[PDB]
């Protein structure tokens, strides 16, 4: 009889994870501040790493990686791919990025102008994308000064927007791909079979930023063909990839999958060290949301990693019962779904 | 040279110390009777090993060592002991009732009827000494005297010796060994009375050393006697620079020269390696890289914590046995492009290393294999400040319904020095996230 | 990696090695806490005394 | 040398005393005569603790045998390990007591009390370092429950840094003598409440049940139900009578189990409880020491929850075991050990095991529970207070109404006081 403790409220994925357990009749749940727990589905923020795997007699597993902020804030991602050797600053999967810190406050605002003036005299394209981890505040421009000014009005990081996505037809679309990635205590690396793309109902204009921006509340707000196409402008692996083949004669495992797997790897292997439970008295496991934007010329580019993500609708039976398979019960045995990005410790 | 005084608090204190000075015998090279055959200087002598030996006419090597404890039972087995010829009576302090696991015995009732007889019984060492350095004091923070007596006697010493620098080895609870659920308390109360009159403190979770003593020697039970063992070999490692000729913290003044550039951040943490079981008849001997590399592995800290999410200040290696400085440097180089070692701005980052050509001595019959080569890391890290949260959570859990805080009104302290301690610690807590995080 | 302060004697040696540049209370106030909580404890017990006492 | 000076008042008090007495010199290897003929120095390691030592070495235990009668303490006198009491600690009279608290504490009990305490003061007098007193004893009659609190209250006047320890049998209508008994318990508690650091309740209901349910004894006796607590007061007293490290004396058993002055009210359990020559597993003896069955204070632990509990394992066995199991208990029933108390529960272990048992479990429990004990006495006392029923015979020794109606309303605050912890 194992036990465990809720402190997040608001995660609607682990909430499923919950409930499942209970349903094994082998998993009891405890007060949120009973400390004889085996597994802690830990808050968000400031969750107290430091007292866990003291507890004689109790194997602890927390389903959150320390450290692992380093990834999946907007400026930490930026300066952790410039920094760090395996990543480089020549990354190639990467949008160029720079961290902007207001002015009523290192910073990158002479070395981001110094590329601005590149591309204004080299005739290239030249528009940017400001945003920030205090957002549902996303502006888009293609004058430096516009940029700069927003942000003084949080520390901002301005990278370079894709002006030449792929657009999904019909519709004349932009759209954007989420991965969700599953790190077990050996840190093993399980990327969920199923993907979603969340699609936007309006036609791409490159001269409002309803057709720029994919996101499912914005497009279910200020979008007015909201499920027109598909049903919450969700389009699964199975339809899109159905469409490379008859748009572009090709699979979503050779255009795209490929590269997001590469990526996944670069960035989890990347701060492994960092954050490695391997020999730590308490271990960790952690579901990852990660954002890639897909070009004319069938490039996956990385956008975002979010530490705390949600699940489609249609996919939390499926997801959640894999984070309890593959996670939970592999540490906590009771009496394949994933992809095994296999990489070396 | 400069002498060293040792005071040895409570069970804890007392029962550590008397490892570390058989240590130290089988070190030098001193038997029980107190004779040491290679010192040819007979009856006086400032040589390192004189730091903390005195010499007497006879060749008799005593240990500039006060032992004292609320209650006579403990203190009686060095009486009676291996090494009772070392210790003249006048240096055995005994109660007769202890502090009950209580800080408030400790400090207020019984302790204010014994602090005289203490201090004039370490004036009587000082006397012998040319040049005193300081005191390093040995307890406990659960136990009544431990906690309660050590910090009334900080106290005093910083009024008698002002100029004198204090180092502790702090015994920090852990409930698979400990004796009183009031534990919490007796360590909050001790560091913030403590705090200002400490320049060095060395903290050892019963935890970290229960847990070595299991998975590297096989110790199904640990006992206090494997548990000392284990100590007694971190804390000669430590003040083996003191006792043997050298370079590197040479005196008490350079420890917290080199490893507390903040005065309230003067806990280091401590990680050793290797440990390896005496049952193993043939292990194969690990080299310079493999021991430096295993000081940056939680499992062999003697506080559990993450050095990752941290950052450093200072750093020490002390090495003992078969070490070249090329050997160093090349394992230091590999571990930098290994692991997460980040240092604040306003330090460099680098070591002080030292190194003793004299591989670590282990008492016969125990635990302890022979290995060729050791390392000690002192590490000022922030991450050491997990140790202050877990400990400051109990009190706040028990504090909040004021449970067994009668037990120390009882004894004359005012309700008011739960809540001053403890805001003094959330200030300490405080000063080590600023320090570590960004 | 740079090696500094090298000291080398028969038991050992010691160095340092740099990899990056940097970026009490008096005895009379003693005495009056003891002496405070010792009075309050008499206090303490004298009133059980008058309650035995009652 | 921390000794203890142990005192029995009345009838089930030098009864259950002299058992008691009878158990652990066997234990030490003392014989009736004094003579030590044991085969061990643990026997002897902290034998002073309970005996002194006298010409020829002989071991006296340091007991007070009291009574307003003579009758039981004849008999002790005339029993196994009879001899071995000090013929000056006899300390009785003539009158008896009538079941009576008042008789006890006011009226027959004053006429003797200054000699008790001339008794206590020599046994104290003697002592390197007195722990404190432990006093056996019932609350449902007259000498031990109102001669007993009135000794309590001068043994604190005369000795107030001093721990006092009880071992104090509550009555229960299944195993009772006279309708009174509920009054006798309800006085004698409040006094207990204020003027013991330390109450083991040993219930006469449980006590009963375990030798009928548990030990198939169709018509249970007071010896039989002796039986038990003389095992159980031996367990409990383990800590105290060999080397150890945990509980080793009063006071810090008292630190360590006693979070608020007044919740100091204990439940003690045993276990084994056989009617015989198999192994007990260390896993058993965890399960029947926590097994409700096996409690003396006839209170269902899972109707409330422990604030500290002290365990002690007796004879050869795995210590590393031993930690397992007592970890598995609280990690398998962590509801039931209050949050705020962080590691509450103590472990210890003994090598010298009981006699006729290799291996056995003491448990020590205070628990939020044994309100229902007070409970249950309240009500019975309420039940005849509200019609006055059998008052006369307690305002005939001086007493008034309101002296009961401050002993209702106490146990009442005492019943409340743990309510409110076990929220
Ligand atoms: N490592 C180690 N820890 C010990 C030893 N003895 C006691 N402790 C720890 O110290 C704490 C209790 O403090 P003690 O030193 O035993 O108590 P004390 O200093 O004698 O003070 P009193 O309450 O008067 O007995 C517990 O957490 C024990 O685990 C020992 O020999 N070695
Ligand atoms: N460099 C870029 N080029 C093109 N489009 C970009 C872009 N950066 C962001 N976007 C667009 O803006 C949308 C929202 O940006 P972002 O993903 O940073 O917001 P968010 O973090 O609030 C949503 P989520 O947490 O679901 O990723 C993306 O889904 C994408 O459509
Ligand atoms: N367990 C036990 N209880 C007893 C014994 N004798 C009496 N009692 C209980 O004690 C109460 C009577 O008190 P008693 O000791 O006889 O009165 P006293 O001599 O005036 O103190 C009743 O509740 C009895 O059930 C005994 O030998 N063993
Ligand atoms: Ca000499
Ligand atoms: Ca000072
Ligand atoms: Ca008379
Ligand atoms: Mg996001
Ligand atoms: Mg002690
Ligand atoms: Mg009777």
Same mark, same amino acid.
């Given at each position: ?39 802690? $589905?830990?808050e ?9 795997g003291? &507890? ?7 389903n ?25 600053? +020549?990354?190639?999967?990467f949008?160029?990025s ?30 940017w ?16 000064? &516009? ?20 657009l ?13 990635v599953?790190?077990?205590?050996? !840190? ?14 309006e ?7 309803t ?9 279910? &707000? !200020?979008?007015?063909? !909201? ?8 389009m ?5 990839? /159905? !469409?490379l083949?008859?748009?572009l ?13 590469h990526?996944?790897?670069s960035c ?14 308490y /271990?960790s ?10 070009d004319?010329?069938?490039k ?5 990693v ?9 996919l939390?039976?499926?997801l959640?019962?894999?984070?309890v398979?593959?996670?939970? +019960? ?9 992809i095994? $990005?296999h990489?070396?410790? | 040279?400069?002498?060293? =005084?040792?005071?040895h608090?409570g069970?804890?204190?007392?029962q550590?110390?008397n490892?570390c ?13 107190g004779?040491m ?6 009856? *006086? ?33 060095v009486?009676? *002991?291996?090494?009772?010829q070392?210790?003249?009576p ?13 800080y408030?015995?400790?400090?207020y009732?019984?302790?204010? @009827? ?9 004036r ?9 350095? *300081? ?5 406990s ?7 309660g ?23 920090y ?11 919490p308390?007796?360590? =909050? ?31 199904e039970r640990?006992?206090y006697?494997?548990?000392?063992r ?18 590197l ?22 990680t050793?390696?290797?440990? =390896?079981?005496a @049952?193993?008849?043939?292990?194969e001997?690990?080299?310079v ?20 999410? *941290? ?14 400085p ?8 590999? =571990? ?23 591989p ?27 140790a #202050?949260?877990?400990?400051?959570h109990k ?11 009668? #037990? ?24 080590? @996230? @600023?320090?570590?995080?960004d | ?14 160095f340092?090695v740099i ?12 005495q ?23 | 040398?921390?000794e203890?000076?142990?005192?029995q ?9 002299a ?35 006298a ?5 006296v ?17 005339s ?26 504490? %006011? ?11 001339d008794?206590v ?32 209250s001068?043994?604190?006047?005369? %000795? ?42 040993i219930?006469?209901?449980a006590?009963y049940?375990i ?5 198939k ?32 004396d ?7 189990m006693?979070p ?11 276990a084994?409880?056989?009617?015989? %020559?198999?192994?007990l597993?260390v ?22 929850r422990?604030?500290t509990?002290?365990?002690?394992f007796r ?28 590691n ?5 272990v003994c ?6 048992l ?12 044994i309100?229902?004990?007070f ?6 006392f ?38 409110? %912890?076990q929220?």
């Open positions: 009889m194992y036990t465990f403790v809720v402190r997040d409220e608001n995660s609607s994925v682990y909430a499923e994870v919950s409930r499942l357990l209970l349903a094994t009749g082998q998993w009891k749940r405890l007060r949120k501040d009973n400390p004889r727990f085996n597994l802690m $589905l830990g968000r923020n400031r969750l107290p790493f430091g007292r866990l003291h &507890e004689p007699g109790l194997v602890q597993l927390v959150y990686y320390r450290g692992a902020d380093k990834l999946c804030r907007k400026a930490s991602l930026v300066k952790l791919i410039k920094t760090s050797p395996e990543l480089s600053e +020549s990354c190639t999967w949008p160029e720079y961290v902007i810190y207001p002015t009523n406050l290192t910073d990158e605002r002479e070395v981001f102008l110094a590329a601005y003036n590149r591309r204004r005299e080299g005739r290239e394209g030249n528009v994308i400001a945003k920030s981890s205090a957002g549902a505040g996303i502006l888009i421009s293609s004058e430096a000064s &516009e940029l700069l000014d927003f942000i003084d009005e949080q520390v901002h990081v301005i990278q370079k927007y894709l002006e030449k996505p792929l999904l037809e019909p519709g004349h679309r932009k759209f954007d791909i989420r991965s969700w599953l790190v077990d205590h050996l !840190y093993n690396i399980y990327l969920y079979r199923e993907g979603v793309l969340r699609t936007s109902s036609p791409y204009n490159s001269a409002d930023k057709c720029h921006l994919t996101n499912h509340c914005i497009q279910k &707000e !200020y979008s007015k063909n !909201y499920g027109r196409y598909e049903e919450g402008n969700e699964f692996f199975e339809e899109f990839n /159905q !469409y083949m008859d748009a004669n090709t699979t979503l495992e050779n255009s795209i999958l490929l590269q997001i797997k990526i996944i790897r989890l292997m990347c701060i492994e060290p960092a954050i490695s439970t391997k020999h730590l008295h /271990q496991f952690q579901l990852f949301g990660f954002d890639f934007m897909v004319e010329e069938l996956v580019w990385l956008i975002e979010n530490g705390a993500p949600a699940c489609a609708q249609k939390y039976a499926e959640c019962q894999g984070i398979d593959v996670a939970i +019960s592999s540490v906590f045995p009771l009496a394949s779904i994933f095994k $990005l990489h070396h410790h | 040279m400069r002498e060293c =005084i040792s005071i608090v069970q804890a204190g007392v550590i110390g490892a000075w058989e240590l130290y015998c089988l070190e030098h090279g001193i038997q029980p009777d004779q055959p290679s010192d040819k200087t007979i009856g *006086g002598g400032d040589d390192s090993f004189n730091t903390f030996f005195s010499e007497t006419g006879a060749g008799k090597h005593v240990p500039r060592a006060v032992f004292v404890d609320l209650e006579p039972t403990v203190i009686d087995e009486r009676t *002991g291996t090494y009772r070392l210790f003249h006048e240096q055995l302090i005994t109660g007769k009732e202890d502090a009950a696991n209580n408030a015995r400790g400090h009732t019984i302790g204010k @009827e014994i602090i005289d007889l203490v201090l004039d019984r370490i009587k060492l000082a006397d012998q000494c040319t040049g005193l350095q *300081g005191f390093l004091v040995f307890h923070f659960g136990g009544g005297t431990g906690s007596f050590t910090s009334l006697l900080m106290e005093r010493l910083s009024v008698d010796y002002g100029k004198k620098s204090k180092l502790e080895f702090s015994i609870p852990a409930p698979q060994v400990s004796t009183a659920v009031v534990e308390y007796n360590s =909050i109360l001790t560091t913030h009375t403590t705090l200002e009159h400490s320049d060095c403190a060395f903290m050892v979770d019963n935890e970290a050393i229960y847990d070595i003593c299991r998975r590297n020697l096989d110790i640990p006992t006697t494997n548990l000392n284990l100590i007694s070999q971190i804390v000669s490692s430590i003040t083996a620079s003191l006792r043997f000729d050298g370079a913290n040479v005196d008490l003044t350079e420890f917290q020269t080199n490893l507390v550039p903040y005065p309230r951040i003067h806990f280091p943490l401590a050793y390696a290797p440990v =390896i079981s @049952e193993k008849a043939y292990h001997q690990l080299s890289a493999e021991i430096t590399n295993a000081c940056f592995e939680p499992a062999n800290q003697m506080v559990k914590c993450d050095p990752r999410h *941290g950052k450093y200040m200072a750093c020490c290696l002390l090495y003992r046995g078969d070490v070249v090329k050997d160093v440097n090349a394992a230091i180089a590999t =571990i930098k492009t290994k692991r997460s070692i980040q240092f604040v701005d306003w330090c460099p980052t680098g070591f002080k290393v030292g190194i003793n050509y004299q670590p001595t282990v008492v016969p019959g125990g635990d302890l294999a022979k290995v060729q080569r050791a390392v000690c890391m002192l590490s000022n890290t922030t991450a050491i400040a997990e #202050w949260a877990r400990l400051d009190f706040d859990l028990m504090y909040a319904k004021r449970a067994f805080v009668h #037990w120390y009104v009882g004894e004359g302290m005012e309700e008011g020095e739960f809540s001053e301690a403890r805001e003094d610690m959330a200030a300490l807590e405080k000063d080590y @996230e @600023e320090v570590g995080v | 990696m740079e090696v500094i302060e090298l000291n080398k004697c028969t038991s050992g040696q010691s340092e990899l990056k540049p940097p970026s009490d209370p008096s005895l009379e106030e003693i009056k806490k003891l002496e405070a909580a010792e009075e309050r404890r008499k206090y303490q017990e004298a009133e059980l005394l008058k309650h035995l006492a009652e | 040398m921390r203890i000076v142990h005192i008042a009345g009838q089930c008090g030098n009864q259950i005393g058992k008691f007495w009878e158990v652990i010199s066997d234990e030490h290897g003392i014989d009736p005569t004094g003579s030590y003929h044991g085969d061990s120095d643990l026997q002897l390691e902290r034998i002073n603790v309970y005996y002194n030592e010409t020829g070495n002989k071991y235990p340091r007991a007070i045998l009291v009574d307003l009668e003579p009758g039981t303490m004849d008999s002790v006198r029993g196994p390990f009879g001899q071995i009491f000090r013929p000056d600690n006899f300390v009785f009279g003539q009158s008896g007591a009538g079941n009576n608290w008042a008789k006890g504490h %006011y009226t027959e009990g004053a006429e003797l009390v200054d000699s008790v305490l008794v003061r020599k046994e104290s007098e003697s002592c390197d370092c007195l722990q404190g007193f432990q006093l056996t004893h019932s609350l449902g009659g007259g000498t031990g429950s109102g001669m007993g609190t009135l000794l309590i001068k043994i604190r006047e005369e %000795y107030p840094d001093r721990i006092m320890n009880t071992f104090s049998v509550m009555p229960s209508p299944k195993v009772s003598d006279t309708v009174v008994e509920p009054y006798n318990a309800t006085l004698s508690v409040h006094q207990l409440v204020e003027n013991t650091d330390e109450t083991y309740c219930d006469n209901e006590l049940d030798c009928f349910r548990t030990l004894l169709t018509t249970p006796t007071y010896g039989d139900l002796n039986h038990l607590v003389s095992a159980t007061m031996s367990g409990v007293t383990t800590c105290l009578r060999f080397p150890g490290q945990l509980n080793a009063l006071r810090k058993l008292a630190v360590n006693v608020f002055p007044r919740l100091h009210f204990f439940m003690p359990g045993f084994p409880l056989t009617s015989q %020559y198999r192994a597993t896993p058993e003896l965890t399960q029947q020491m926590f097994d409700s069955k096996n409690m003396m204070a006839a209170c269902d632990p899972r109707h409330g422990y604030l509990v002290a365990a002690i004879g050869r066995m795995s210590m590393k075991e031993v930690d397992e199991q007592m970890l598995n208990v609280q990690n398998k029933n962590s509801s039931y050990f209050v949050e705020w108390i962080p509450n529960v103590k472990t210890a090598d010298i095991p009981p006699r006729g290799k291996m056995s479990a003491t448990f020590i429990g205070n628990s939020t529970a309100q229902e004990l409970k249950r006495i309240s009500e019975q309420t039940a005849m207070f509200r019609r006055k029923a059998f008052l006369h015979w307690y305002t005939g020794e001086g007493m008034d109404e309101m002296e009961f109606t401050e002993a209702e309303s106490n146990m009442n605050d005492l019943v409340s006081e743990y309510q409110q %912890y929220d």
